[PDB]
Design a protein around this ligand. Sequence first.
Ligand SMILES: Nc1nc2c(ncn2[C@@H]2O[C@H](COP(=O)(O)OP(=O)(O)OP(=O)(O)O)[C@@H](O)[C@H]2O)c(=O)[nH]1
Ligand SMILES: Nc1nc2c(ncn2[C@@H]2O[C@H](COP(=O)(O)OP(=O)(O)OP(=O)(O)O)[C@@H](O)[C@H]2O)c(=O)[nH]1
Ligand SMILES: Nc1nc2c(ncn2[C@@H]2O[C@H](COP(=O)(O)OP(=O)(O)O)[C@@H](O)[C@H]2O)c(=O)[nH]1
Ligand SMILES: [Mg+2]
Ligand SMILES: [Mg+2]
Lengths: 430, 430, 49, 427
Amino acid sequence: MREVISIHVGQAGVQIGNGCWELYCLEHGIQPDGQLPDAFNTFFSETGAGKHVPRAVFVDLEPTVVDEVRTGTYRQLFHPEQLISGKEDAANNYARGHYTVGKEIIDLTLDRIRKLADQCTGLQGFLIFHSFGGGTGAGFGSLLLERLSVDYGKKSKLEFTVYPSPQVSTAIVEPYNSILATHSMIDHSDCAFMVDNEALYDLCRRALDIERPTYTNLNRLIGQVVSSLTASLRFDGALNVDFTEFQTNLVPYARIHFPICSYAPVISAEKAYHEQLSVAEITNSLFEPANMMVKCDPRHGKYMACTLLYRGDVVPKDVSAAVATIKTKRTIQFVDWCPTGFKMGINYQPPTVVPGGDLAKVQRAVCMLANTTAIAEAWSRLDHKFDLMYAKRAFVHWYVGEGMEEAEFPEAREDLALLEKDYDEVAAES
Amino acid sequence: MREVISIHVGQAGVQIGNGCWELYCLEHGIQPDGQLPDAFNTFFSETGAGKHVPRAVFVDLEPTVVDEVRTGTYRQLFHPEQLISGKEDAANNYARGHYTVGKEIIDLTLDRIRKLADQCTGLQGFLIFHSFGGGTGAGFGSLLLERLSVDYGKKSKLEFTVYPSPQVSTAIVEPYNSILATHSMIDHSDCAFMVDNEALYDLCRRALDIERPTYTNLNRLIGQVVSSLTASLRFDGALNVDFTEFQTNLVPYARIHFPICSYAPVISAEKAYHEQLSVAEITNSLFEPANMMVKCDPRHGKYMACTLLYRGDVVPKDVSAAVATIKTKRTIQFVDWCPTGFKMGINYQPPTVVPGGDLAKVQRAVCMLANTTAIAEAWSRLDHKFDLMYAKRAFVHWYVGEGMEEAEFPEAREDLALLEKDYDEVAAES
Amino acid sequence: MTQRVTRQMFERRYEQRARDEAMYSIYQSKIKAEQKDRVQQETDERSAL
Amino acid sequence: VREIVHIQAGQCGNQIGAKFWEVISDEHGIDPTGSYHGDSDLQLERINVYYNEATGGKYVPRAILVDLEPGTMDSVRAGQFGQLFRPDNFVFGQSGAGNNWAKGYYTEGQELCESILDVIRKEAESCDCLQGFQLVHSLGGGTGAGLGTLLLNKLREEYPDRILSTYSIVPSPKVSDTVVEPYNCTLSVHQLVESADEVFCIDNEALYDICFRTLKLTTPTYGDLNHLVSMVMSGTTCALRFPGQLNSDLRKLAVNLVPFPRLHFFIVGFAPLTSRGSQQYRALTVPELTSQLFDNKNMMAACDPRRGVYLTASAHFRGRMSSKEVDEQMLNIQARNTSYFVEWIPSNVKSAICDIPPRGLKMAATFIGNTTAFRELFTRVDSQFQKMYARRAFIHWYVNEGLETVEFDEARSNMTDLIQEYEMYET
Ligand SMILES: Nc1nc2c(ncn2[C@@H]2O[C@H](COP(=O)(O)OP(=O)(O)OP(=O)(O)O)[C@@H](O)[C@H]2O)c(=O)[nH]1
Ligand SMILES: Nc1nc2c(ncn2[C@@H]2O[C@H](COP(=O)(O)OP(=O)(O)OP(=O)(O)O)[C@@H](O)[C@H]2O)c(=O)[nH]1
Ligand SMILES: Nc1nc2c(ncn2[C@@H]2O[C@H](COP(=O)(O)OP(=O)(O)O)[C@@H](O)[C@H]2O)c(=O)[nH]1
Ligand SMILES: [Mg+2]
Ligand SMILES: [Mg+2]
């Protein structure tokens, strides 16, 4: 009827994917073993009898993360062929994961993703998760997009990645992986969303009521954003928005696809008792500089794209009043090139809460996806970090010895420089 | 029947309120205990037995000033709930009084203010008092106005605030809190009146004959102005003005809403016997810049218009004989686009004196409230001072540490520049 | 023919509070406001007294 | 008798179509399972206009539902009244259109057009006499605009004689749901100018305002928003469905209202509209209806006619009333406001009466008129189109589907011609 397929690369993608599929099973009323105790065809397939199977494939170059799913409670759901595990990881090396080791398993992975698409008739879309800092996430994602771009042509390829934080970091060679990855996604990706763990920690602490979050809580927040995005394809609504609708609306050009995400309300399960959180309340909360999951300054970032997906008991008039009120604010400056600048999706299905979770039981919620020029601020931070290490040739020997040519560094450097020039040109008035 | 609620914020607001409620007790003839030895309902509530009680709220984040009223003579008159005192003041820091400490007590006061409105059948609006340089006056004052704007909407929120003096200054960080407050008031406030201490010191020395005044003497002069403002509501009179009549005539222009104040005749009790004090005399005294409650010369700019209020013996035709001569004065620059500009109000209740006071028993008196482009002179001085601190970032670290985001500093600066553009654009002619 | 109109039953049942129940509160409050407006005439007559 | 074929396109069209066939079923008294449980033989006179009869005493409406994705179709397939709808009438694709007008027209509209045309021809030749087509669509771009105008052209090629009356919901020119509106709306008008006979413009913003001011709804649902539009459509065709003292069909309306072939866009309105509580106290008479009809707040198009001038005006009525009262009211409203009518056209007000009123209301009316106030809507979308075309943003999606930018200039030139024609005819 209409079908979606997901791929998860790296431990960040697999662990995020773990949280997502528990969210869907609770939302769709499917036990972990896969039997019922509708929309199912969008994400799940019926294998005869009374068992279901998810439309997902989990890939990593190390067996630890995949074996965790194999040992966990959710092992009964997944198909053993969907769980593909390598032998040795990329060791945070883009060249190692792109040429030496990624090419060993690339052919096997492409077979399974194409094979599962044969059962998937009404297909338009892919979901891919990346960890930009990790070598496998950036390196394998580049090769995977290169193959999928030519094998399938005009198909909606959407990615959900984790952007490196401006100051928080866990790998010293992270800037090298990000720039080389950015050089390949900028041509092979239709539209990819990014979040940074620094703002995720900040939002989880101020608005949410967690003193010391782990990766599990952060994955749950990401899963709610994904669930809101896919709500239109699964449930009826006054304004349903398709995958192709997002691609047309959000981007004004080819290389400016990168949007930012915002979700409201993000109030905790305890403090939420006091507030009704009407349409005007949640709409105002979205545009707060603190509610962004990307640590970027909205003051420097003009807006020329917005998408307001509401979930729950919502009336379109209240959206019309709320959006009109938002446009009157002087601080939120849209670009001259975007009078309308809005997509709205209203759906009558409320969000879902998970036992042992952290979010509140809100009756209505709204997820926000917008494109702003403030992302060019993060590109300069990554560019300067890359320039400092490459000036004295900090880590050239590792990538060179793994089959990568030396001249590729200036090529990606020039590719990033062109992107920043494009952002300044587009943001400028005329 | 028709009622007004007065709320006071900061040390300046409390001691100004102490003087104002002293005047009301004498004027209506209510003993300090609340008993009697009419318009009472406008300011007081008749609780039975023989007692009345003011419709006032006193707010400060530190107990010293409020406990003076609690231990003072007037303590039995006020309701203990109305006296709200915090634990530690805002330390003249806008961020501390707005985000960290202000939000600790904001919801306690709003219940107290709203509870008073329940007993208030014919409520018209609010009177609010500030000191711009103070941390609680600005930081908590901003937070109070933003809430009251959405709590009640179409109710006239009039303000009467103490501006920083052109040269007299007691706080170094005074320009910082002033500009950050300006952005909040300019939108949420209906109208905000303007006074400063430096002009008060000069007037209290020249017209009133006092060598060395204190804050006590300055507060009583403020007390007379608010009484003449409220005289039309309370006592009989041929022409009355209220908060659907003051607001429209005085400050119609969306962001030009800052007027200036004056009072006449202001003269010592010794010398008042030697003059006759006709309507022409007191009216002519108002228009001299020396009498201005704000140290700005109207000759530098242009009068938009005025609003005059007479009390006591004043005779109607005598007013229009005095004010017709005003136009003949070339120095009073009325633009051709404001052709009428002289809202009138006449009340038969004469001014009231206070024991140990500084004013005479003048049989008739007049109060003046006008908007002029000369107030843009005051804003320019504040703007120039602020840039000198902010170029070298003289005090940013204090504000950022207390929850304030640095992005607000240029935003409030941008709003003031837009306000200054508005005043210059109004001064334009066609 | 169920699923959409059942959703419409669900959708109108949620709107029911923005519907009817908004009206019961306002016309009941208007009736009480008339009882208030008439003691206004009584109390202004008392002030006239 | 005199038959009409109803076509519904996309998300907006199918939702309106569901509400429309609800009202039509209520008018004729058709049980949603198909059985006739009405109350008057007058419903059976012209039930053939909108319905075919199936053996066994069941009626199948002349409704064809069209989309490129099954989401709206799965919504309507159980709908509420959808059991009347014939299962083979459902035609749908397997791809979200994406609201790229070039995509919806050339990439996927062409593939489906052959199938829809044959489905259309099935009902077209199954009637004793087709007289006109009815199309409901929105100017979004994917299927309502792109595919809708394509089918309008193909139906014009097939049936030059018949009346192609289409209902259009223009993107709301303060807030609307996609950035690519100026492109899609500009192209849609270009096709609709030449190929369509009657175009009705309805704005969502005016629909919100009418619900607040007159209906006193706290929150306007899409359900009631579509209900008012369904009432307008039923009133338009009510003259053919029931007798009256002075009849007026679609062709009578088209000849009277349209002075020149291009200027044929119409603003519509309805009366009486009353809140749920105050209807008991209203003294509903002909002057009351006339006041509501000509009231500027009852017009569901957000373009104040008082800024412009009127060219033609039409009035429909339902119920037993005196003809002299209607004639006098029309004459009074014409003479009282001579500042809003053209000098060279005397008797600018048309009138019509129907015998049977709608259920629930003892007396009702419908207003359709033509004015020069439409210059604002075209100018607004043109200025938006000029900005986006100047920056040439969002055009890469349309280029990838094979639409060349020279087509945009032609579409703007046509609108500029239409704007100029409206400007000069006001004099
Ligand atoms: N939010 C979130 N981020 C994660 C999580 N797990 C890993 N990451 C991110 O992943 C990055 C580390 O790289 P990996 O996740 O190991 O990516 P990879 O594909 O396995 O690459 P290599 O391990 O170097 O072979 C860090 O920067 C983290 O921010 C998680 O559970 N939650
Ligand atoms: N004219 C006059 N001004 C006063 C008086 N009291 C305080 N001020 C003004 O108030 C300013 C100092 O701020 P505060 O009085 O402390 O007001 P605040 O909002 O409570 O500030 P914090 O004590 O930090 O909370 C001085 O610059 C004075 O101009 C007064 O009695 N008369
Ligand atoms: N009045 C009304 N308008 C609707 C409703 N549902 C959707 N719309 C409008 O229809 C437009 C979408 O048209 P669509 O079906 O997508 O046309 P297409 O993109 O060309 O296929 C949106 O702008 C909505 O505002 C409804 O129930 N009532
Ligand atoms: Mg790894
Ligand atoms: Mg203080």
